[PDB]
C-alpha cells in the first residue's frame, strides 16, 4: 500500500488568490487517489456540507471527473451556495443544480482578504437579464438596461454597470467578512481515468 498522486487539493484550498464570484474559477481534478477525509477533519472550515456523498465516504468511491469551482463571497452569502437556493449569488453569479452530487466547503478569510481602507478587488454581479444555469459562468459586462428606453451602453437613468465591488474591511461584522468557497463537483463518466479514494490494508 504505497502512496501515489493524490491530486493538487492544496492548490484548490490554500491558494493565494481567489476569483471574483461573478467570474468564478473552474479547475479540473483527475488522475489520482484523492483523500477527502483530510479536508473534513482539518476542522478549518466553517462550512462543510455535502449534497452528495458524505465527506469521509468519498474515500470509498472513484470518480472520473472532479471539478473544483472557487471564489470569494460575503459571509451572509455562504448560505446561497447550495442546491435549491435563490438570491443575488444563487440567481446570477454562481449556481448549483438542485441535483448537485458534491460538497460545498467554505471558510472565513477576513485576515487574508479584508484590507484597511477596503478591499474593492472582489466583484459580484448585481444585475443580469436572466438567471444562470447550474455551473454557468457569465463575465460579460454590457451596461444593464433596467428601463424600457434603449440603453446605448451608457450608465444613466435606469441603466447600470452590472458588476459591483465588495468593500471588505477588518472590522466588518460577521456576515460582511469575506469567505473563500470551494465547491467540489463529482461526475462519473466514461474514460480510462479516475479520481479515487485510498486503499486500506
Amino acid at each position: 500500500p504505497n502512496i501515489t498522486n493524490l491530486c493538487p487539493f492544496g492548490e484548490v484550498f490554500n491558494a493565494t488568490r481567489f476569483a471574483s464570484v461573478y467570474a468564478w474559477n473552474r479547475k479540473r481534478i483527475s488522475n489520482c487517489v484523492a483523500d477527502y477525509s483530510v479536508l473534513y477533519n482539518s476542522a478549518s472550515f466553517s462550512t462543510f456540507k455535502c449534497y452528495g456523498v458524505s465527506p469521509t465516504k468519498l474515500n470509498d468511491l472513484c470518480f472520473t471527473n472532479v471539478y473544483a469551482d472557487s471564489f470569494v463571497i460575503r459571509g451572509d452569502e455562504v448560505r446561497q451556495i447550495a442546491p435549491g437556493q435563490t438570491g443575488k449569488i444563487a440567481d446570477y453569479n454562481y449556481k448549483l443544480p438542485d441535483d448537485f452530487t458534491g460538497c460545498v466547503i467554505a471558510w472565513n478569510s477576513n485576515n487574508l482578504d479584508s484590507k484597511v481602507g477596503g478591499n474593492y478587488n472582489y466583484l459580484y454581479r448585481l444585475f443580469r437579464k436572466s438567471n444562470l444555469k447550474p455551473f454557468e459562468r457569465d463575465i460579460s459586462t454590457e451596461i444593464y438596461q433596467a428601463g424600457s428606453t434603449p440603453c446605448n451602453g451608457v450608465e444613466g437613468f435606469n441603466c447600470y454597470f452590472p458588476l459591483q465591488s465588495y468593500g471588505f474591511q477588518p472590522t466588518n461584522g460577521v456576515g460582511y467578512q469575506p469567505y473563500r468557497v470551494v465547491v467540489l463537483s463529482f461526475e462519473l463518466l466514461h474514460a480510462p481515468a479516475t479520481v479515487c479514494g485510498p486503499k486500506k490494508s
Binding site: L126, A146, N158, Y160, Q164, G167, V174
Partner: protein, 595 residues
C-alpha cells in the same frame, strides 16, 4: 413603475452601505482620538456622503411615489426623495447654514463674566452648572441664572428670528405649513389601514396626556415647595410658583438636584452600591459583562467580537482628549461599538445597560433595508435604553447579582425615597418638555408675533410649569435659546413621547414576566417571554408604523400615561397625605420680584 424604483433602491443600498461606513468610521476615529487629522477625515467623508445623498435624491424624483404599491420601496424611496434645504435658493441656503453655525457657536462659547472681578469668567459646563446645582445662596444662584440669559440669550435673539423665517420657507417649499409641522412629520403615518397618524394628532395627544398627569405634578410641586421654603425662606411663597433659579439647574429642566433638600426619609440609607463595587474590586469590564448578562438572560443576542475588541470602554490609553460621553454606535456592515469611559460606579452600571439597550435595538434591525435601519420614531430608541436601565436599578436586581447586600431591608420609607428621586428626574421634566414644544410650535406657526415671544414664554412657564422667572426680562432676550436644543436645531418633544413609551413598555414587559407587585419593584432580566416580546418589535426598525410597533409591544396604537401614573401611584399616595396640611397647586400672580 415599481420595478425600476426597486432596481434603483437595490443599486442605491449597495452604494449607501459603503459611503455611510466610511463616514461612520471616520467620525468614530475622531471621537476616540481628538486631533486635526481625524477632523479632516470625518469632514471630508461627511461631505462626499452628503453629496452622494443629494445626487441620489435627485435621481429619486424620477420614480413617482404614487406609482409604487409596495411599502418597502415606497418608504425607502420617500425617505430618499426629500429635498431638505436644497429647496432654498443658493443664497438662502448658505445664509441659513451660516446662522445655524453662528447659533451653535454662541451657545458653544458658553461663558459669562462676573462683575465682582470682570476678567474672571465662568463656563456653563463647570462654573455655572456647579452653582445652579450645589449653591444654596439665593443671590449667587440668581446671578448665575440671569447671566446666562443676558450675554448668551440676548446674543441669540436676532439669529433666532431669522432662523425661524428661513426654516419656515424651507418647510413650505417641501409642502409643510411651517417648520414645527415639518418636525411633526416624524410621527406621521399614511395609507396603512388604521395605523395612520396625522401630524396634528401629536398635538392633541400631547395635550391630552399632559392634562392627565398634572395631578401628579401638582402634588410633587407642593411637596417640593414645602421643602424648598426651608432652604430659601422669605424668597419662596407658600402658594406660588417656584423661582426658576432655585430649581437646581440653568433652565429649570430637572428637579434632580433638589433631592438632597427634599429627601422624604433622610434617616434612611440609599442603595448606592458603588461602595460594594469598590470592595469587590469591580472594573469596567465587569460592568459591561454584567450588562451583557442582563440581555443574554432575557433571550437577546450577546455582543459581537467587534464590540468587545474595538469599543472605548475605558479612559483613553494616553493623555488624550476623546469623546468619553457615553454613546452607542452602529457603523454599518454589522460593525457595532460603544464609547464610554467607564468608572466604577452605579451610574455607569446603569449607563452601560442604557447604551447596550441602544445597541441591541440597532442589532435587531440590522437586517432591515438601509434607509429603514432606525427606530420606529424619535422617542423609541431612548425608551428602550431607559427600560433596560430602570430594571437594572431595582434592589431586586442588585441583590440578585451580588451587588446590593442580600440582607438589605427594603421597606416603605426606602421605596418612597427611591420614587421621589425618580419623580424629580421624570415627572418634574414633563411640563418642561411640554411647555417648550408647545411654545416653539406656536412660534413656528406664526401664532406668536415676534414682539410677544418672551411675553408668552414667561406666562406659559408660570401657568404650565409653575415656575416663575425672577427677572422681568424684555423682548431683547431669547431665553429658550439659552438651552442647547433650541439654539442647535433639535426637536425636543421626543423626550415627552419617550417617557411615556418607556412606561408603557415597562408595564407590558413586567406583565409578560409575570411580576406580582408594583411596577417599581420589577426586574424582567429573568424573563425570556418579555425578551421575545420586545425583540419582535425591535427587529422591525422603520419598516412598520410606530403605531403598530406599540400595538405589538404594549397592546396600544398610541401613547398612554396610565403606566406612568401606576409606576408612581404609591409615591402619589404618600404625597397626598404629606400635603394634607398645605396648599396644592400654585398661584401665578406672585413673583419673587413683586412689590
Amino acid at each position: 413603475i415599481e420595478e425600476q424604483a426597486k432596481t434603483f433602491l437595490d443599486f442605491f443600498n449597495i452604494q449607501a452601505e459603503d459611503l455611510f461606513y466610511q463616514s461612520s468610521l471616520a467620525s468614530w476615529n475622531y471621537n476616540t482620538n481628538i486631533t486635526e487629522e481625524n477632523v479632516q477625515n470625518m469632514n471630508n467623508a461627511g461631505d462626499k456622503w452628503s453629496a452622494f445623498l443629494k445626487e441620489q435624491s435627485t435621481l429619486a424624483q424620477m420614480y413617482p411615489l404614487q406609482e409604487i404599491q409596495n411599502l418597502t420601496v415606497k418608504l425607502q424611496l420617500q425617505a430618499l426623495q426629500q429635498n431638505g434645504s436644497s429647496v432654498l435658493s443658493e443664497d438662502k441656503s448658505k445664509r441659513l447654514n451660516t446662522i445655524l453655525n453662528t447659533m451653535s457657536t454662541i451657545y458653544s462659547t458658553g461663558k459669562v463674566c462676573n462683575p465682582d472681578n470682570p476678567q474672571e469668567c465662568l463656563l456653563l459646563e463647570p462654573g455655572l452648572n456647579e452653582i445652579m446645582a450645589n449653591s444654596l445662596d439665593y443671590n449667587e444662584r440668581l446671578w448665575a441664572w440671569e447671566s446666562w440669559r443676558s450675554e448668551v440669550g440676548k446674543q441669540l435673539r436676532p439669529l433666532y428670528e431669522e432662523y425661524v423665517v428661513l426654516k419656515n420657507e424651507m418647510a413650505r417649499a417641501n409642502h409643510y405649513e411651517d417648520y414645527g409641522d415639518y418636525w411633526r412629520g416624524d410621527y406621521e403615518v399614511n395609507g396603512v389601514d388604521g395605523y395612520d397618524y396625522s401630524r396634528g394628532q401629536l398635538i392633541e395627544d400631547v395635550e391630552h396626556t399632559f392634562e392627565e398627569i398634572k395631578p401628579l405634578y401638582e402634588h410633587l410641586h407642593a411637596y417640593v415647595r414645602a421643602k424648598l421654603m426651608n432652604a430659601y425662606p422669605s424668597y419662596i411663597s407658600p402658594i406660588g410658583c417656584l423661582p426658576a433659579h432655585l430649581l437646581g439647574d440653568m433652565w429649570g429642566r430637572f428637579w434632580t438636584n433638589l433631592y438632597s433638600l427634599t429627601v422624604p426619609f433622610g434617616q434612611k440609607p440609599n442603595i448606592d452600591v458603588t461602595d460594594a463595587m469598590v470592595d469587590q474590586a469591580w472594573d469596567a469590564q465587569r460592568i459591561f459583562k454584567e450588562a451583557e448578562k442582563f440581555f443574554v438572560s432575557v433571550g437577546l443576542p450577546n455582543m459581537t467580537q467587534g464590540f468587545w475588541e474595538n469599543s472605548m470602554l475605558t479612559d483613553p490609553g494616553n493623555v488624550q482628549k476623546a469623546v468619553c460621553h457615553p454613546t452607542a454606535w452602529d457603523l454599518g456592515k454589522g460593525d457595532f461599538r460603544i464609547l464610554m469611559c467607564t468608572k466604577v460606579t452605579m451610574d455607569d452600571f446603569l449607563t452601560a445597560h442604557h447604551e447596550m439597550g441602544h445597541i441591541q435595538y440597532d442589532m435587531a434591525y440590522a437586517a432591515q433595508p438601509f434607509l429603514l435601519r432606525n427606530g420606529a420614531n424619535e422617542g423609541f430608541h431612548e425608551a428602550v435604553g431607559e427600560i433596560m436601565s430602570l430594571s437594572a436599578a431595582t434592589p431586586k436586581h442588585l441583590k440578585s447579582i451580588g451587588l446590593l447586600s442580600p440582607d438589605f431591608q427594603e421597606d416603605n420609607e426606602t421605596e418612597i425615597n427611591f420614587l421621589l428621586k425618580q419623580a424629580l428626574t421624570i415627572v418634574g421634566t414633563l411640563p418642561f418638555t411640554y411647555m417648550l414644544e408647545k411654545w416653539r410650535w406656536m412660534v413656528f406657526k406664526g401664532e406668536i408675533p415676534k414682539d410677544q415671544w418672551m411675553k408668552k414664554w414667561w406666562e406659559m412657564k408660570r401657568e404650565i410649569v409653575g415656575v416663575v422667572e425672577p427677572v422681568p426680562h424684555d423682548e431683547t432676550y431669547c431665553d429658550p435659546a439659552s438651552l442647547f436644543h433650541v439654539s442647535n436645531d433639535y426637536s425636543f418633544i421626543r423626550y415627552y413621547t419617550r417617557t411615556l413609551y418607556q412606561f408603557q413598555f415597562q408595564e407590558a414587559l413586567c406583565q409578560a414576566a409575570k411580576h406580582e407587585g408594583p411596577l417599581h419593584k420589577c426586574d424582567i432580566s429573568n424573563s425570556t417571554e418579555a425578551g421575545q416580546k420586545l425583540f419582535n418589535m425591535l427587529r422591525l426598525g422603520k419598516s412598520e408604523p410606530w403605531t403598530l410597533a406599540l400595538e405589538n409591544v404594549v397592546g396600544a396604537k398610541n401613547m398612554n400615561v396610565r403606566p406612568l401614573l401606576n409606576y408612581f401611584e404609591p409615591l402619589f399616595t404618600w404625597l397626598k397625605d404629606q400635603n394634607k396640611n398645605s396648599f396644592v397647586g400654585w398661584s401665578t400672580d406672585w413673583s419673587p420680584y413683586a412689590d
